[PDB]
């Protein structure tokens, strides 16, 4: 009896050969005498090469390992929304087992170039910095890339936390994170009532690297089941720079020849079979979307190097956050030089394309005229130029943690930035004025809010100003 | 059967041939004792470590030891466990070498205490606390401007003589003085004279009745080296998970650490990493970093040194090991030499701590507007050279008075200084310096001589030291 039943040969370092297994199939699941599965991974003449999802501190050589007759799955469904599991499925928050009844497998074709559709709905992530002049749509996958200690976690959950209103169901899966940071999160979620939506995929430091490698496959594998119901996902991978450390173990220890920085020859074929799969279907496939946010960690701001270089060469876009803007009070970091939307601006409201079209240049040009006006002085209107907007510019763009902004009340403001309302009044006071100004609208322009929010497009053309200057007749300077 | 016989001996490595359906688990523990039969042999007392199974019932090993005068065909032995060090009260005050045994000449440790293995899977999501915490260290430079958190990793730097290892005496004293705490100190890949000198100074001092010590020095092997900072985290968990105790745990370098690993897994075999670390380098890291958090009744925050090499920060091993890291404090020779202590730099340290939501309103701004102060009379200490102390601004006059003071309160006198200064210490709580920073910031001592805030606890005690003086 070899069919479906064999021995282990050799174990170490997570990995292991095993004899027999005569009738296995190439990715199937296998499981140990532990209980601690496996993936067939090799099938050579003689041995099969199996890779161990968990602690294999508790296998021996001469153990036995027998077939599950199942290609690599996981388990899906809408039982699994609230709750914190391992890239296997199994509970983690330890609020009882899972209820799921549908499984998907690890590994699926991605939708072909005919099941698509362009991309052109809009993804409210609350942030102005973000909503404003690097949009994001449905179907898109948009890159978050920066050094560490520069906000790319709150971006995600100011994010997840926005979409409270809009039907969407979002992911969080955290590759490498400590589990301090994972258990914060957590908290914050649950705090701000995101939970009811949410499904967090967990892979710690201390797990061994085939989880790492795994868990963003299981994360877009539990998205795709909502996808394909015609539904909206939105899917955030807190690294892919750790799977990739991960993957790169796993390819050593099997003894792969490393190409660039020791990395495997297939590093690109990893992330770009991951990313693929997030699309936006067309009205044929069902009309649904899954959306993907990749991190990607920096080291002292090298946009140059390997992996950062092969991600962006993936995704439709990203957004560069800078430590030097982080720090000394830029908190949001957001570098309009380096930032872009490819597939974006075609999934923007209306009202908001109108406006602050432009902003994105205008800041650009107004960074480099800071650098240039240091060397002197310059022409009144370079004066005007650089002080009047960019600064108020800089300063309205800034935002607090977990403090979304509905897109009304960020057009609002934008507007009124735009048009030269805030050219008077001093660098250091608007923002107290973004603060009182939305409760002004609050309280007076409830239905030019409401018209905004029916038809996407400004009130009226004229129409605002009258309000503009009734509340900054009760707005007092400093 | 429980026994097995060596096969092959090259370095460090051994492999070890056992009876079929009997193989050790891995990071189980073999001992090998050999008594020398005829004058071609020599006494062994050694200790192994399992490390992979290769197959056909033969298993490798890491030796803790130096495997000169091995024979193929000697016996050894299966402890069914992984390494285990004595844990307890017992471990107070004295000094172990990676293995549990003792080092000083208090004597042996009776064989019915308890003791716990080295390896342990980290503790789980549910375990962990909820809420972030701030440990109350007592040292005003650190509790205003670069808080410590409960279950946080710190990174420490410095140069030589600006005063580290009185800093962590202090840290021992007012922890085990304030929060009932203990400390271990676990030595990896250090002068061996330097450790004799810590163990001297902190006889001196008193710390050494209320912390553990463990060394491992330089010239220790590999495998010994690699497991000095899981002995001394394995002592120092015994606390945390059996009494609800906050305990201190200092890593002295945690570099070689890394670099004890690549050596051993050079000799294990595997294919080099990137700049020729190992290709597990992150997956130990974790191993070792991720046992440290706080827990539902307890905590370990560590205080660690870090070696970069060649100054780049980009190198994997630095990168690795910052991506743990919840703070900094970094040492200045500046102000050492100026007479400040402890010598705190207030712009280069960093934490995570420092935010609105963990700290509170009032703790931040009062710290943002300190660190705007001293960056103004940093950029004005440049125009003073420039043009002139008379020829600067009243407002930048009245900076440059506040920042004197500022800078000179941030001092403090230390329980552990008096061998040396000859005054007491004190234990500042963070309430008290937050008031005491607001009071200086609002101008309320504006007319007190600048030299009265030198080295002082309170801000009471500054006009108090005034009043004495004139
Ligand atoms: N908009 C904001 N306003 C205020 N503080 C912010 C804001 N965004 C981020 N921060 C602060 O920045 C710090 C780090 O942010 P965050 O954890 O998101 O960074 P990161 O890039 O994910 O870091 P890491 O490398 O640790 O994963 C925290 O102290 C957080 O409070
Ligand atoms: N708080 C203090 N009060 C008085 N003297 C101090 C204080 N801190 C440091 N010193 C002085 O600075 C010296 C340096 O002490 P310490 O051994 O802690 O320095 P270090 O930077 O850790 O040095 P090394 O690299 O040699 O270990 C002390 O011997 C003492 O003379
Ligand atoms: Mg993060
Ligand atoms: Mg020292």
Known sequence: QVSDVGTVIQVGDGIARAHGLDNVMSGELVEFANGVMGMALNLEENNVGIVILGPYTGIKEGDEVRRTGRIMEVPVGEALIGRVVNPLGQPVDGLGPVETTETRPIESPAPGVMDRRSVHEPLQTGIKAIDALVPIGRGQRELIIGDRQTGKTSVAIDTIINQKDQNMISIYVAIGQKESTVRTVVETLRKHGALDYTIVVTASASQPAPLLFLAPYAGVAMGEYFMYKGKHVLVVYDDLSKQAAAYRELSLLLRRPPGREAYPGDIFYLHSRLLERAAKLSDAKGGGSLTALPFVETQAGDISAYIPTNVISITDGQIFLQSDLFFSGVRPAINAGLSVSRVGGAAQIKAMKKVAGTLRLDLAAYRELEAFAQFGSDLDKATQAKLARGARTVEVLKQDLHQPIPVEKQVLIIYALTRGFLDDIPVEDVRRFEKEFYLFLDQNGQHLLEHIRTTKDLPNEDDLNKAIEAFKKTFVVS | ?470
């Open chain 2, 1 to 470: 059967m429980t026994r097995g016989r060596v096969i092959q001996v090259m370095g460090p490595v051994v492999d070890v041939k056992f009876e079929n359906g009997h193989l050790p688990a891995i990071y189980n523990a073999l001992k090998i004792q050999h008594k020398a039969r005829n004058e071609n042999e020599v006494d062994i007392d050694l200790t192994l470590e399992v490390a992979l199974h290769l197959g056909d019932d033969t298993v490798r090993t890491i030796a803790m030891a130096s495997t000169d005068g091995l024979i193929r065909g000697m016996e050894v032995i299966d402890t069914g466990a992984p390494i285990s060090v004595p844990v307890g009260e017992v471990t107070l005050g004295r000094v172990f070498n990676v293995l549990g045994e003792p080092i000083d000449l208090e004597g042996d440790i009776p064989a019915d205490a308890r003791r716990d293995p080295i390896h342990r899977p980290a503790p789980k999501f549910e375990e962990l606390a909820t809420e972030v915490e701030i440990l109350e260290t007592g040292i005003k430079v650190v509790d205003l401007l670069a808080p410590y958190i409960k279950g946080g990793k710190i990174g420490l730097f410095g140069g030589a003589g600006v005063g580290k290892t009185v800093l962590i005496q202090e840290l021992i004293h007012n922890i085990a003085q304030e929060h009932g705490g203990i400390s271990v100190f676990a030595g990896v890949g250090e002068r061996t004279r330097e450790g004799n000198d810590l163990y001297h100074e902190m006889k001196d001092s008193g710390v050494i009745s209320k912390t553990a010590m463990v060394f491992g020095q330089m010239n220790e092997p590999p495998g010994a080296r690699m497991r000095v900072a899981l002995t001394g985290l394995t002592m120092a968990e015994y606390f945390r998970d059996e009494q609800g105790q906050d305990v201190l745990l200092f890593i002295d370098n945690i570099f070689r650490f890394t670099q004890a690993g690549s050596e051993v897994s050079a000799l294990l075999g595997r294919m080099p990493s990137a700049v020729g670390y190992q290709p597990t380098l992150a997956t130990e890291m974790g191993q070792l970093q991720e046992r440290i958090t706080s827990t539902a009744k307890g905590s370990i925050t560590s205080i660690q040194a870090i070696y970069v090499p060649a100054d780049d920060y980009t190198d994997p091993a630095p990168a690795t090991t910052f991506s743990h890291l919840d703070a900094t404090t970094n040492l200045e020779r500046k102000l050492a030499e100026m007479g400040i202590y402890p010598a705190v730099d207030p712009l280069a340290s960093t934490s995570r701590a420092l935010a609105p939501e963990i700290v509170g309103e009032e703790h931040y701004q009062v710290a943002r507007k300190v660190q705007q102060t001293l960056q103004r009379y940093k950029e004005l200490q440049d125009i003073i050279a420039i043009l002139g102390m008379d020829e600067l601004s009243d407002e930048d006059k009245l900076v440059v008075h506040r920042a004197r003071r500022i800078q000179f309160f941030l001092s403090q006198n230390f329980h552990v200084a008096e061998q040396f200064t000859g005054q007491p210490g004190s234990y500042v709580p963070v309430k008290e310096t937050v008031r005491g920073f607001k009071e200086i910031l609002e101008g309320k001592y504006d007319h007190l001589p600048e030299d009265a805030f030198r080295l002082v606890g309170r801000i009471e005690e500054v006009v108090e030291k005034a009043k004495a003086m004139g």
